Design a protein around this ligand. Structure first.
Ligand SMILES: [Mg+2]
Ligand SMILES: [Mg+2]
Ligand SMILES: [Mg+2]
Ligand SMILES: [Mg+2]
Ligand SMILES: [Mg+2]
Ligand SMILES: [Mg+2]
Ligand SMILES: [Mg+2]
Ligand SMILES: [Mg+2]
Ligand SMILES: [Mg+2]
Ligand SMILES: [Mg+2]
Ligand SMILES: [Mg+2]
Ligand SMILES: [Mg+2]
Ligand SMILES: [Mg+2]
Ligand SMILES: [Mg+2]
Ligand SMILES: [Mg+2]
Ligand SMILES: [Mg+2]
Ligand SMILES: [Mg+2]
Ligand SMILES: [Mg+2]
Ligand SMILES: [Mg+2]
Ligand SMILES: [Mg+2]
Ligand SMILES: [Mg+2]
Ligand SMILES: [Mg+2]
Ligand SMILES: [Mg+2]
Ligand SMILES: [Mg+2]
Ligand SMILES: [Mg+2]
Ligand SMILES: [Mg+2]
Ligand SMILES: [Mg+2]
Ligand SMILES: [Mg+2]
Ligand SMILES: [Mg+2]
Ligand SMILES: [Mg+2]
Ligand SMILES: [Mg+2]
Ligand SMILES: [Mg+2]
Ligand SMILES: [Mg+2]
Ligand SMILES: [Mg+2]
Ligand SMILES: [Mg+2]
Ligand SMILES: [Mg+2]
Ligand SMILES: [Mg+2]
Ligand SMILES: [Mg+2]
Ligand SMILES: [Mg+2]
Ligand SMILES: [Mg+2]
Ligand SMILES: [Mg+2]
Ligand SMILES: [Mg+2]
Ligand SMILES: [Mg+2]
Ligand SMILES: [Mg+2]
Ligand SMILES: [Mg+2]
Ligand SMILES: [Mg+2]
Ligand SMILES: [Mg+2]
Ligand SMILES: [Mg+2]
Ligand SMILES: [Mg+2]
Ligand SMILES: [Mg+2]
Ligand SMILES: [Mg+2]
Ligand SMILES: [Mg+2]
Ligand SMILES: [Mg+2]
Ligand SMILES: [Mg+2]
Ligand SMILES: [Mg+2]
Ligand SMILES: [Mg+2]
Ligand SMILES: [Mg+2]
Ligand SMILES: [Mg+2]
Ligand SMILES: [Mg+2]
Ligand SMILES: [Mg+2]
Ligand SMILES: [Mg+2]
Ligand SMILES: [Mg+2]
Ligand SMILES: [Mg+2]
Ligand SMILES: [Mg+2]
Length: 150
RNA sequence: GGGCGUUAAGUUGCAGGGUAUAGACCCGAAACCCGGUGAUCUAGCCAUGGGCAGGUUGAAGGUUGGGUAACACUAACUGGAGGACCGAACCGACUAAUGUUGAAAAAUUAGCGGAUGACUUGUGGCUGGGGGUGAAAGGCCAAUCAAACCGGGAGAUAGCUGGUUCUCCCCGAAAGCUAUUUAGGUAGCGCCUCGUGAAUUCAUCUCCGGGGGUAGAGCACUGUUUCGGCAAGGGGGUCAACCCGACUUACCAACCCGAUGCAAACUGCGAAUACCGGAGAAUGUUAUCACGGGAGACACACGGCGGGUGCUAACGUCCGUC
RNA sequence: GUUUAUUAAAAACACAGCACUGUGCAAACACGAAAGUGGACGUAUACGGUGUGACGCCUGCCCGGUGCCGGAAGGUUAAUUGAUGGGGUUAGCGCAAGCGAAGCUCUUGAUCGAAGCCCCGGUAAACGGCGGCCGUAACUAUAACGGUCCUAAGGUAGCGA
RNA sequence: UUGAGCCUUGAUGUGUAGGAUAGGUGGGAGGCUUUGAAGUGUGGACGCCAGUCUGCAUGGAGCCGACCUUGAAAUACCACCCUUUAAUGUUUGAUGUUCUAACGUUGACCCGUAAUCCGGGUUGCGGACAGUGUCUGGUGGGUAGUUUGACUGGGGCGGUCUCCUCCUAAAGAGUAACGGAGGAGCACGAAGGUUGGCUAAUCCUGGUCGGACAUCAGGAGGUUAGUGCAAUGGCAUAAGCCAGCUUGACUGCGAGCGUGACGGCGCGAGCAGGUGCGAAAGCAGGUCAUAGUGAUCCGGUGGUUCUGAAUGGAAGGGCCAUCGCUCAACGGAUAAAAGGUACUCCGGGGAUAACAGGCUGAUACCGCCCAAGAGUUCAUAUCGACGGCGGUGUUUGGCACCUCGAUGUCGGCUCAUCACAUCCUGGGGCUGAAGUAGGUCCCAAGGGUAUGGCUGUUCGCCAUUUAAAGUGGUACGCGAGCUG
RNA sequence: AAGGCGGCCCCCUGGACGAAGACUGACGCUCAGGUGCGAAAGCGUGGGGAGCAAACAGGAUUAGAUACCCUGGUAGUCCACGCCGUAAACGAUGUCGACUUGGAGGUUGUGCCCUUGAGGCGUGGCUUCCGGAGCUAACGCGUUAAGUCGACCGCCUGGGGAGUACGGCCGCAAGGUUAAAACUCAAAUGAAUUGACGGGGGCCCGCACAAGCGGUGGAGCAUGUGGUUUAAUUCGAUGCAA
RNA sequence: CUGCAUGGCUGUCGUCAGCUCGUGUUGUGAAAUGUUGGGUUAAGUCCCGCAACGAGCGCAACCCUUAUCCUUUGUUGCCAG
RNA sequence: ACGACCAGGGCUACACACGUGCUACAAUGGCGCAUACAAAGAGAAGCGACCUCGCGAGAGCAAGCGGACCUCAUAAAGUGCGUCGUAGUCCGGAUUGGAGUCUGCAACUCGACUCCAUGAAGUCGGAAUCGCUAGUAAUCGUGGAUCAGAAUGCCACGGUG
RNA sequence: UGCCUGGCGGCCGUAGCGCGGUGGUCCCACCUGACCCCAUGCCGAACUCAGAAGUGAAACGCCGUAGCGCCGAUGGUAGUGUGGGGUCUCCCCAUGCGAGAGUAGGGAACUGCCAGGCAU
RNA sequence: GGGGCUGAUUCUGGAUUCGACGGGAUUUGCGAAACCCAAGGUGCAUGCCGAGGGGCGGUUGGCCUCGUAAAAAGCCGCAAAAAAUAGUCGC
């Protein structure tokens, strides 16, 4: 419905623990491009400086140059609007060993863009094997049980 | 009260100017329909008879020999089929030249293609026009074809070009407005001619009543616009070059005053010439108005003046005035 | 080979071959107001129509739209038939306005009523169409790749100033 | 297999109040007993299993009847029969099948008959089908009739077509362009009328959250506010604002005037009737004025002092009100209409375009004036910023001023002529001119001023030479000299 | 012969094995070049097409799935006549002759003995599993040898390049066949062993489950833990096993 | 400070039952047997078979208490008589 | 000076989440009055009987004992009575103001005991989850070490069963 | 006849602002209170009814004052009708009309009716 | 060279991105840095020249100290150079 460019690869590439429905803060010519304008949310992650967890990786194509005064930067760091009450998770459980929180998807909420955030961590190519093995094994167990019980 | 009318005579013939129907001042279309004629040219088809000199190439098939268990396959002899080959009659016209009131309303000379086949030709017949036929070009249908020829409706229509024939005298325009499947036409009005009736009816000059907002002028108003003061600040301060920043730095600078300008869509001002009315002599062949008969015209240009537009360029264009 | 007799003889038409479609005979189709004829004194290896045009490699995706074919579950639906509603008229009731039986007529139209249309599917060798946009690989370039906007599908093989 | 009339009602109910399945009302008090009732068992069904239409092997002799609740007396009576069913003949519609006599036979045999037409007789098959006439729905460029507007600095494309506001518009009115700038196809039962009362926008001071800004009290200001809306002209008596009552947002006229060719449109004192407000004189025929709008014909509604095809009526016609058009191409040609023609045709026009010729020169080319500077110093040996002044008609343009009763247009070959804003030769000045060799300027037209590849060349690129391979005018010279 | 052949019947026909015989007389084996047959898939023409099913569409899974799961579905798989001679066409083991311990079978024929029952002893062909000597690097072969020899043909000489290009032939095509060179590397491999691993299997055990019975997450409080604050919130312990 | 130089110590796997060696034998060899297989158990505990035969650390016992009974010594304890 | 000095704070704090346990949910349960049975332990800067007192903690005086002698130490659950009656309860005992006591020079940070007074939460608790196979689960009390005092923690002991 | 005040007109800046001062005999204005006649989108500030203790402050009316506002000459200038001319996007000549903006200067109104009171 | 449609999550004239990040940093108690001004203490403090300053140097010259003038001590720089990157990903 109101869904926009989403990053479903990061869901398989990470272990999503908790999610944040926090909003995004962006300048002109970009929110219009969210409707149509080729926004891409690849390589998305938070870049906490002090309390400024900007989303760094996103390429939103500028569709016009009619205002040829401001310099266009598709790789701009977008600000994020999150409650200070729930921002404690981000200044907390991020820098342990490898914890990250990445942008899973971006959609519309009554003419305002909301980017879904999620706390996760890497898999080192050995957790992926275990996940695939378990996903296949549950299916195989169900199939063999059904075949045996006819 | 208002409208229409009571007042105040028409009618029948003759001659003349219009109008309406008929052809309607005269010639001219391209086009439509109806009834007949054509296949002797040409297109196709049907039936019946002719024509294709001469010289090349050797497929199928058939024999002999080799070969195969039988085949298959190969060598030699014969073979004469090709919408075959070169090339004559015959058919056609791809190039060049001549010819263009020519020998000829498509031809001549030198070259050219097919020339045993989907060929060509003679004779007779059929296909008849919104139809015929078409190896398909809108090609042919008798030198005429995106609808053949002849006779009729039919003098079709033509807001379109041209022409309109003897004389004299008098008066004398317009090329503008409105509306228009309207712009090069038309109807009314604005103008022209004739007749009738009507009053200082009308015009020139003078005097007297009037309202402008144009030229010009100006910035009370709306915009525009330059400078100085009033004045807050900022901007790589000469200075510390780090500090309160010594604060003054050919930079923008609120509101208001003083000075200087611009304006078709600005007027606190504002003419001349224009326009209407009243009066007065003097002048004009009623020059004025109303009705009736007949028109014409509704393509204007130049020059002066005030302008839009264009480039205050155009013998350019759009308005008013003489 | 043929083609615009009389400015175009060609890449233009035709061609053998290929594909689709219609056609069970009193066949389709065409000329015919009709009879009748051709097709054809043929019989699905026959005939007509439409496209391409010997031969070799092939004819890849789409029914979204317009046609064609199969269906009548539902809605609408002609001609046709006519339940009544509303008036005209007068026998006649009313001292008068005015009610007003039957007959005949003016007008509305309950119900029946097929094809067709909407609809459900197929069919493209039927008419037809088959995308642009951003980032990303060791110097630079490009993008095998990844995301989202639409369509019914984004052009496969092959070829190319 | 199947509907209305019909074979008869087998007929279905329930006021918490209730032997409860209420007798249409009349007569309420029974035919009931051989006008053939309970007892006994219980397919279907009223099942809210109280009752019960109950149906029916055994019966073979009184259930009911008053009424208990009593808002309402029993369905025990008679039945003009409903709060609605029931089946077979039933009234003849559709579907299906059976049959033949209609009809068909481009099946066979015979006959007229010599004969593959035709007709008649026998017969097989199909069969009330097929097929034909009328009406009718759908499809139907296969065919026919047509339509596709106008202005336009040629035509097409674009834009516009009606109405209103300011300028142009030259001080009465009016006045055009594809000139310069904005709006309208409504709205109000109150935003109309009367009466009564009041008069801002804007800038300040102080004051709870309250601030460039809500509200409040005071202060400057005088229409720079407001008008239901675009602009213009006005409004202080207010035409702006608040409240009451109201419907004059009346009916029929209307002397007079203004604007229009006309159709028409607009203002209007005042008259008669009947109303609203205000004590009253007085004000009210809509809105502060200008856009808010469409003629005629045809038909829709109501009323009517009329006409009514012999009479009496009625359909019908007109009369007054009123309704249906983005006829927006808006003075509207039909209720009903798009394109191509290079296969084209006719009447016209240089009233009107493309080539040329003519007028001007925005553009084009060339010259000149001041001089930041470039140029080591030095403006001018050579260039020249920001501008201006010019000359030719030579590039691209403007006009439609001759030519559509005919002026052959690009380029190439032959043939030339003229001008100098001179390519070479000739003469000279200044040079950042040591010499050769260069730059610029001035005078000077006597002469000369290339060959091939590309492409239709003009133009242009390249290769090789020459002292040079100049720019232009002459219908962008020359087709009654030639090709195409 | 190989490829490969499965209801039944009819017709033609190839091949194989046995008791007892008769007969020609080395006529015997192999075989480059050549010839023929030859799984399926594929191609051409003419037919047919029930089911299945490349390509293709849709649905589902997945981060992605142009696939495995599902619904459709054309070529093809079915027939006749034609073309290729391609397979892990394998027994990864060429054709023919002789010899070499044994056991347990299947199929087929014949001889003999009293066949009272597939009673008993023999004797040939094919085929199956163990197994001695021997062989082999070992797996394994083992009278049907991979044991010892005899006759012949074909093939091999490091892994890639490469069974590739060119060249010749064949074929309508897809391609087949014959078959290199340049360049890189010091490796490429096979049989077996020990660990390890498997989304391989089997067995066993422990309050590991089941069975029971009580508890912890709900609520005061206690120390302990992580985070926060703070001057420090004193050090380490950080899954069972803090 | 460095338990990422260590000693010592401790927890878990786990009181789970395996971890090895000598000789011999087998295979050219890496290597295997023993340690595998049936019963049985808490167990590599016991037995049988098998080129295995034995041994070490090992799972048990030897160590500490309870459960019947004997003797000795009798205080601060017992009252059988 | 990262070596070293002592005094005052903080290791005991906090919007939070977590391991573990004690405490309760009330009729087998709390309120009180006879009444019963254990083992093993520690004791001289000590264990510390009596007695006088204190509603209570303990104050004063204080015997004996390196202990089969004395103390800590009338153990309870059990038992027989009464009583309450299903209620935020005579359940549940936390927070609160004040009072003293033990204790160590000093308990605002920061002890424990006491008893008068307010008398919280909580009323068998999701998903999950842990322990036990016999004198063990489960309940009741006692004892021991650390230490001036400051155990729901730790280690042991028996009763029921 | 003089002065003052109140009401209604002529005219709409020489007519009105600013500064200072004036007046309570009469008029004028503030002022007291409210059952009522009347009303507050509340509230006797506005309407109104019943009244003169106080007042001339506010507001009125008056006199001077040139900071204003305003009027406004003569002359000159621009423009313009007529007729004739130039070097013709614009001007000149003869004649007629002659602005606006300035300057000198003026400018603190004029006036009629009705009613009251002062002096007479 | 020209027109015509979109630059509008409403094409619906009234959106607290719910949240971080600037705002009078509007608001309620409050510490001399959210500040701050004649009286009890009675000591050698105010302008006085000062003194060059914490490990080192300097501060608007009176931000430290005094009592007969000085060590300077309350802040900055030399210094405290460790600030330099989500995850997966050669050994
Ligand atoms: Mg012919
Ligand atoms: Mg021969
Ligand atoms: Mg030939
Ligand atoms: Mg020939
Ligand atoms: Mg001949
Ligand atoms: Mg010839
Ligand atoms: Mg010839
Ligand atoms: Mg024709
Ligand atoms: Mg002809
Ligand atoms: Mg003729
Ligand atoms: Mg005729
Ligand atoms: Mg006629
Ligand atoms: Mg004629
Ligand atoms: Mg005509
Ligand atoms: Mg006509
Ligand atoms: Mg006329
Ligand atoms: Mg006169
Ligand atoms: Mg002017
Ligand atoms: Mg005209
Ligand atoms: Mg004319
Ligand atoms: Mg004109
Ligand atoms: Mg003209
Ligand atoms: Mg003129
Ligand atoms: Mg020709
Ligand atoms: Mg030809
Ligand atoms: Mg073709
Ligand atoms: Mg296709
Ligand atoms: Mg379709
Ligand atoms: Mg159909
Ligand atoms: Mg139908
Ligand atoms: Mg037509
Ligand atoms: Mg036109
Ligand atoms: Mg036009
Ligand atoms: Mg005018
Ligand atoms: Mg009023
Ligand atoms: Mg009126
Ligand atoms: Mg108005
Ligand atoms: Mg009509
Ligand atoms: Mg009549
Ligand atoms: Mg009548
Ligand atoms: Mg009537
Ligand atoms: Mg109408
Ligand atoms: Mg009009
Ligand atoms: Mg013509
Ligand atoms: Mg021209
Ligand atoms: Mg000419
Ligand atoms: Mg010029
Ligand atoms: Mg210089
Ligand atoms: Mg001529
Ligand atoms: Mg001519
Ligand atoms: Mg010269
Ligand atoms: Mg020279
Ligand atoms: Mg010179
Ligand atoms: Mg096959
Ligand atoms: Mg499938
Ligand atoms: Mg799929
Ligand atoms: Mg092989
Ligand atoms: Mg052989
Ligand atoms: Mg063997
Ligand atoms: Mg090959
Ligand atoms: Mg065992
Ligand atoms: Mg201690
Ligand atoms: Mg003057
Ligand atoms: Mg003057």
């Amino acid at each position: 419905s109101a869904t926009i460019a989403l990053n479903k690869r990061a869901r398989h590439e990470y272990f999503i623990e908790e999610e944040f429905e926090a909003g995004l803060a962006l300048q002109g010519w970009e929110v219009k491009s969210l409707r149509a304008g080729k926004a891409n949310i690849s390589d998305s992650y938070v870049l906490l400086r002090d309390g400024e967890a900007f989303l760094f990786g996103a390429n939103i194509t500028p569709m016009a140059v009619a205002s040829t005064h401001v310099v266009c930067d598709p790789t701009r760091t977008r600000k994020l609007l999150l409650n200070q009450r729930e921002l404690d998770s981000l200044y907390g459980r991020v820098n342990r060993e490898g914890y990250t929180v990445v942008a899973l998807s971006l959609y519309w909420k009554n003419a305002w863009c909301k980017v879904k955030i999620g706390v996760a961590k890497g898999k080192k190519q050995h957790d992926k094997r275990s996940d695939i093995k378990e996903r296949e094994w549950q299916v195989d167990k169900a199939r063999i049980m059904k075949n045996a019980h006819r």
